[PDB]
């Protein structure tokens, strides 16, 4: 079949593209004048934020243009050569905007394994833009204005050779999935899977030990027998012997903590409950000095991880909707999907799933620049 995608349903999308435009703009004009005003100088991490925030600002440039196309029920006003331009130029920046997020996330991973001048930015920066064009020639070619069969309207459409329209319009939809989502996300997610892997190795999980210390003290603090007090302390010793294994002096804090439990064990093997009790009253001040140290260090490991997550969420939250509907749109083109309740809704949804992909352009500035200042 072939639906009337025009309805009362897409009355929203003209105005959102404006919110996304004006909001996505101010936010991204800031990011440019930061780097534009003082520069890196020669800062590799801040050079990728620019090309991104630039590509984002070119995506967002054209949105009031496409705000027409959806306002005029898919009636393109600007004639068939202008349709080829902005169509290709949009795909160009989209693919570049995404592939710079790809870079940023690989940079941020290397920023974490080897925390220590720009040189290769000369390849990576052009090489992206270049492929963003080579990836956008198919779109320049097939894009064109056609009086569309059903609507009775002159629409800006990917006009393949009618003979095999199904074939082209599918393979093309697959090349979005692969080149715009499946690969970029292999790069972006496994990076998150490197920070998680190297902020677990570059560290220790001592809370398994710390709970023991905090548990067995409240036992000692309200003990009745010498049995319990000897019990609590023999566990609190093994806790500190592991914790010990794990520059920082933190290791001496566990030398001291052993040499405060051994002494109190010695009291508790005599049968001195009040003595042992008051002996662990002192432990608490060792533990308190060193628990407090541990939490200031783990909040530095915390803010690292939460931001490496928020990067891959912002991505998936904006570019999964569009790339699912594209994979269905594409399966339907092959002929795997037939039911037109589906194809009604695929071509009633892609409008919104698209607008989301452009929200990410509005968002990267908050993730990549606005954090830290």
């Amino acid at each position: 079949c072939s639906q009337k995608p025009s309805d009362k349903h897409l009355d929203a999308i003209p105005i959102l593209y404006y919110i996304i435009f004006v909001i996505g703009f101010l936010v991204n004009i800031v990011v440019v004048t930061l780097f534009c005003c003082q520069k890196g100088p020669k800062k590799v991490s801040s050079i990728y934020i620019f090309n991104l925030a630039v590509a984002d600002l070119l995506v967002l440039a054209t949105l009031p243009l496409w705000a027409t196309y959806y306002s005029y029920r898919y009636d393109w006003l600007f004639g068939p050569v202008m349709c080829k331009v902005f169509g290709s130029f949009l795909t160009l920046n989209m693919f570049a905007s995404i592939w710079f997020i790809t870079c940023m996330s690989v940079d941020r991973y290397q920023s974490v394994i080897y925390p220590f001048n720009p040189w290769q930015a000369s390849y990576i920066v052009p090489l992206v833009w270049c492929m963003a064009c080579l990836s956008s020639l198919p779109t320049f070619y097939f894009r064109d204005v056609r009086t569309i069969e059903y609507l009775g309207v002159n629409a800006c459409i990917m006009a393949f050779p009618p003979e095999k329209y199904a074939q082209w319009s599918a393979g093309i939809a697959l090349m979005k999935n692969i080149l715009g989502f499946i690969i970029p996300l292999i790069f972006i997610a496994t990076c998150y899977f490197g920070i998680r892997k190297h902020l677990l190795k570059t560290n220790a999980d001592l809370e398994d030990n710390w709970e023991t210390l905090n548990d067995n003290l409240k036992v000692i603090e309200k003990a009745d027998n010498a049995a319990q007090v000897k019990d609590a302390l023999t566990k609190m010793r093994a806790a500190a012997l592991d914790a010990q294994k794990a520059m920082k002096d933190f290791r001496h804090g566990f030398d001291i903590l052993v040499g405060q439990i051994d002494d109190a064990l010695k009291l508790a093997n005599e049968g001195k409950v009040k003595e042992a009790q008051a002996a662990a009253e002192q432990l608490k001040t060792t533990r308190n000095a060193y628990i407090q140290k541990y939490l200031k260090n783990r909040i530095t490991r915390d803010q690292v991880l939460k931001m490496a997550a928020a990067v891959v969420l912002a991505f998936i939250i904006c570019w999964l909707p569009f790339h699912v509907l594209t994979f269905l749109d594409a399966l339907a083109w092959m002929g795997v999907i037939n039911s037109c309740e589906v194809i009604a809704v695929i071509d009633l949804a892609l409008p919104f799933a698209i607008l989301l992909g452009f929200t990410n352009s509005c968002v990267n500035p908050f993730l990549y620049c606005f954090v830290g200042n």
Partner: antibody
Amino acid sequence: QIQLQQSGPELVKPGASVKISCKASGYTFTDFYINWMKQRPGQGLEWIGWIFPGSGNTHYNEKFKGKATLIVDTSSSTAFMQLNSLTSEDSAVYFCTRPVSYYYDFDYWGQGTTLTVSS
Amino acid sequence: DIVLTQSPATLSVTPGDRVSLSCRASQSVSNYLHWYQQKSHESPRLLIKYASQSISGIPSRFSGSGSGTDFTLSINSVETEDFGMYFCQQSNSWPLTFGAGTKLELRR
């Protein structure tokens, strides 16, 4: 009653070392944590370190580590604080004190060893 | 190191008046705070432990209060004997830290 007797004022000359004492009587020595303080006539106190006689195991304040040891004799039931490279800045009073404890009625101070440095 | 900031330094009481002594904390010290009295530079007398816990021997008129980051020692009626230093001490974490202290002196 529990008592702490500290050896009385030493006469000391710049750069020389010291060994201030603290006889402990009333309680069985090897069971309780013993601190050491400092005080300057007009100021508030400054904690030097704890020691547990039953082990000999210690900890100190950073400021004092460079220039303050602690040491214990079991048989005699007496505690020492060995200071060194002394100068006008150690012209102060010094207390060995069993610290405050929830499970006990009282804490237990010395009575203060007055230390003056001058050639 | 946990600084312990006593206020004020001097304070001219009258035998009969109630008085409050501020002892603030640069960071959290919990209830692990102890007050002290000292008259003639001698070994100081433990008045209150764990902020409000009463000491055997100390008269009723001394009462402690607050918790965590801000503590006070309310003497419910000062007498002639009460003059001298008062020092607050955190038992929270090494290094143990004292107040610079509040000197009480008679009004006239």
